[PDB]
Design a protein around this ligand. Sequence first.
Ligand code: NA
Length: 994
Amino acid sequence: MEAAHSKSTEECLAYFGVSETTGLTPDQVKRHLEKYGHNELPAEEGKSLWELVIEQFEDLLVRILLLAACISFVLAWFEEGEETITAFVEPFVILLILIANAIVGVWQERNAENAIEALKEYEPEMGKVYRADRKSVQRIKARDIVPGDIVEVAVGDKVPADIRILSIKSTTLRVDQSILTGESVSVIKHTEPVPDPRAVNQDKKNMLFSGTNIAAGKALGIVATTGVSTEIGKIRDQMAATEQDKTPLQQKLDEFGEQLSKVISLICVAVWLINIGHFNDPVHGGSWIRGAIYYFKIAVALAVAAIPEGLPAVITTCLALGTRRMAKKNAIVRSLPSVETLGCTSVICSDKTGTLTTNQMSVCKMFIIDKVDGDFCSLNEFSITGSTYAPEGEVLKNDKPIRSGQFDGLVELATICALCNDSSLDFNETKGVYEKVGEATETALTTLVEKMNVFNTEVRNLSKVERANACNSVIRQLMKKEFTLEFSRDRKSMSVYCSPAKSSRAAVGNKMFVKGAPEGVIDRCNYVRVGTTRVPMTGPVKEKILSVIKEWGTGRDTLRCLALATRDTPPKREEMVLDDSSRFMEYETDLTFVGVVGMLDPPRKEVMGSIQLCRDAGIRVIMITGDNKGTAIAICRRIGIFGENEEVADRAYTGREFDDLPLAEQREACRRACCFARVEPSHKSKIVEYLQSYDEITAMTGDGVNDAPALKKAEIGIAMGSGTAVAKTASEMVLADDNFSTIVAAVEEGRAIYNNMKQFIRYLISSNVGEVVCIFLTAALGLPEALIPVQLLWVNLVTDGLPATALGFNPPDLDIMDRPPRSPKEPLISGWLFFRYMAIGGYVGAATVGAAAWWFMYAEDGPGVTYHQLTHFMQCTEDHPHFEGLDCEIFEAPEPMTMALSVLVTIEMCNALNSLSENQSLMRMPPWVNIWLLGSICLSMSLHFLILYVDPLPMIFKLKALDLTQWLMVLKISLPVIGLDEILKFIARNYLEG
Ligand code: NA
């Protein structure tokens, strides 16, 4: 029964055919259970370990590598010899990388928690029902509860289902609905029907929502809905129906995956079409087995040379490090891929209270009526200092300190603020400052009465803790509080019924003290107080009151106003039903206007600044607030969101206004809006949709289960440190301090990190290019293999991975926040950059072959066979050129490989320096700009020497220590790469910058 709140208790009983005194029968229980299912959100998918392990082998590149391991394995099997301790190393090494890769992938999932599963924390194990098969209440499992069940709840219980309250057993009933409505103070519940069938949760004063807690009282009710049909269940469905796209880099990297796959295969064909000469060969003679071993040997190295095997580890390391760095700045990021997205944030939607403001309330102004005489009128306006809850400050009329007590209007004003109030103070001796107890707005009133001291009570003598609630306690003793009529949004006020304290045998003197939003409160005033006297409310004096209120709310003061009034002749106590909240406005009429207080929730000190940063960075800012429209706007002007005097007609909306607009116009409104006031339950989420229809990267703040859907939808959901665990688990980021400025800082960190990622990504991929050239050249020049897979894999994971990581510490550009958001469509490598890395690739691939060849020719240790061209034969079945001497296995000498590999290693260390800046010369941005990079290079070289000397390793990699001559050559052929890029950067700075 979805509409239970708008039905009478009798209609809900009738609908389900259930007896309030016996409850459902065992047949009803069965049937109901068959129709509605059990009371519980559905289980998460049964993602098994075996399935999880399988998923680690889905990516195109890991398939290639697996394939290449199989070929490597078959080759290290279908090969003759006795050296097995240096044969199966390769295929094993490739497999071990894939195992570690899959291991990590699995470790990630075991540690990942989804928000949908966090929802289940709010479903209690047990609940209490009345069923016809028993007399006394039975405590059954909450999943066994069904619509129609008569249920019982009491203080401390977690509501097991969405329930229509039938009967309140205790005096009142109080609920903690913080998790669903953001009302953090316990709300009072009733049993009368709520007329509007489209009432938002906050106004269903007769409902208990599954997952909430009874704060006080005992109640009996009937279950309206269970499972996915409850308020939180609908929230679960929205979240589950939300599909989350891959981050821009994830998408672009997946595109590179396909493309590189397609590239790898083409190069294999290219190596085929180059040997189509073998078709014109005698069928007899030559080795076919060895001919195929030749292709599969290069296909393996080719795949291995082309994959940036260490890239995923480098990225992760970088992101993890950045994350620790962001946490130091109060930004707790939860998902590593979010760090990139955060940098692209084009829109931030922020709640005002507690994020843009401090949520530390303070009364700054107040006024009473001074006199009314015909068309003439004067108010007494005052000021109050002190912006803490501490009772330290003073009242001032025209800056001159006055004494509240000398004004009677003020005695009463204070009596309302003190009596018509459910909050207090407390001096916390631990922190040594005054803290609130209750609501912000109410404690500010408590604070205000203490500064006012309307009865000049001896207060300075009292201790620190006793000082807290002294002037209040005084006012309390003056009036007995008989009862209170709670605040409702329909009337936007509250009242308290009070009788004189010293009273033996009397029935006259009773008062109601009314506090609330000025418009409705003032409309119900027929009288205006003037000291102790009273006069009729008149058209002119009304405008006077309203104009001041308007000025205070809509001006640079940005104050939240509250009207205070009293009912002099309140209805007789017996004539009032304290149960029908719909009668409260009626009991609050024929009032006397006493005064107005204006309070402030101050902007955080950093917000002004942070908002300006965004304007520089081309990031739009939208405030979502509970202020009315005028004040919403005024606060927006105040903080920088709006220009002080600029037009805003079409950039500010209330929920009402926004709902009235047709779908097209709502979408339109969202492109230009910077202020949403009084926003509905569904709005954040619809606002996010529209924003995404313009391809905005959207940040959205929230803190309750009811924000969870929007948090999940937006690309950067942002939760408050002080918020619910569910909102956190639904968000890309948590604000340790709740401060809007933390967001802007974390965006800046994201830009800085992405710029560096581009660098080490381009560095690594460019490294693969040269590796591929080296393999290809060797093949299409019939040379001895210059580099082998085990060597490549070492370079791609260790030798280059260190500098790649060090590149993540590249200093950030000063102009980072002075450029618009990066477009998600922006390609990683494109145009000039393709050429650069193509040329760089060329040179690296040539240098490595040439390093081997030079040893094979113009060097001593190896044959002085210049232009002999090892091209010709690699079979040795004719034995022509080297006539005298029985040697033919010098082709596999470890010296040439060691020349090539040391060239690669040395070049890439050099190219790591060329990677300090995309376009700036090493003349302008020197190597030492990044000490981590310098350190990294020393480490990688020490590691190269490690594999060169430490016995097991030089055999495994197939290497031999180099002569100072040979090393001195390695340098000669490596250092020029620096000159090459310097030239190319020069061409970019001077002949492209237009
Ligand atoms: Na999200």
